[PDB]
Design an enzyme around this catalytic site. Structure first.
Site, short mmCIF file in Angstrom:
data_model
loop_
_atom_site.label_atom_id
_atom_site.label_comp_id
_atom_site.label_asym_id
_atom_site.label_seq_id
_atom_site.Cartn_x
_atom_site.Cartn_y
_atom_site.Cartn_z
N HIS A 11 0.91 -1.24 0.08
CA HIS A 11 0.11 -0.07 0.45
C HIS A 11 1.04 0.97 0.03
O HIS A 11 0.30 2.53 -0.28
CB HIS A 11 -1.57 -0.30 1.10
N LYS A 38 -5.26 -9.51 -7.72
CA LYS A 38 -5.62 -8.64 -6.78
C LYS A 38 -7.43 -7.48 -7.47
O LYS A 38 -6.68 -6.73 -8.40
CB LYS A 38 -5.15 -7.55 -6.33
N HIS A 112 -2.64 -2.66 8.78
CA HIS A 112 -4.08 -2.66 7.67
C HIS A 112 -5.02 -1.52 7.37
O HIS A 112 -4.88 -0.06 7.75
CB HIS A 112 -5.53 -3.54 8.15
#
Length: 115
Positions: A11, A38, A112
Site C-alpha cells: 500500500h 487482486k 491494515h
C-alpha cells in the site's frame, strides 16, 4: 513487525511519476499482487512519517470500531481490475485521488488499510 512491512509493500509508494493505467499494471506486478490478480488495491503516496502518525493524535482520530482516520488528506491511487479473468495479464484502471485514509494500528504502526 511483519504486518507493518506487508502494509508498506502492499500500500505504499512514496513518489510515483505517472498515476495512470500503465502505472497500476507495473506496480501491481512489482509488489506481487498479480498471481492471481487482486481485484482492487490502493497505494498511498507521500512521506512515510505522516502515515505512521495516523496511529497517534498527531495525525489521526478514532474511527468506528478499532480503526483510525487521518486528519490530513493523502494522494492515493486506486487500481481496479478490468476484464473477467483472475490470471495475468492483469489489466487495471487507475484513479488518482486525494482523501483521508482509514487504517488499523497495532503497537503504534499501521497494519491494515480499509479500502
Amino acid at each position: 513487525n511483519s504486518r507493518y512491512t506487508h502494509f508498506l509493500t502492499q500500500h505504499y509508494d512514496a513518489k510515483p511519476q505517472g498515476r495512470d493505467d500503465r502505472y497500476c499494471e507495473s506496480i501491481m506486478r512489482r509488489r506481487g499482487l498479480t498471481s492471481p490478480c487482486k481485484d482492487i488495491n490502493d497505494f498511498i503516496h507521500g512521506n512515510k512519517r505522516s502515515i505512521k502518525a495516523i496511529c497517534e493524535n498527531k495525525n489521526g482520530n478514532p474511527h468506528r470500531e478499532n480503526l483510525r482516520i487521518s486528519k490530513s488528506s493523502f494522494q492515493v491511487t486506486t487500481c481496479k481490475l478490468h476484464g473477467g479473468s483472475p490470471w495475468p495479464p492483469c489489466q487495471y484502471r487507475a484513479t488518482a485521488g486525494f482523501r483521508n485514509v482509514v487504517v488499523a494500528c497495532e503497537n503504534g504502526l499501521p497494519v491494515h488499510l480499509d479500502q
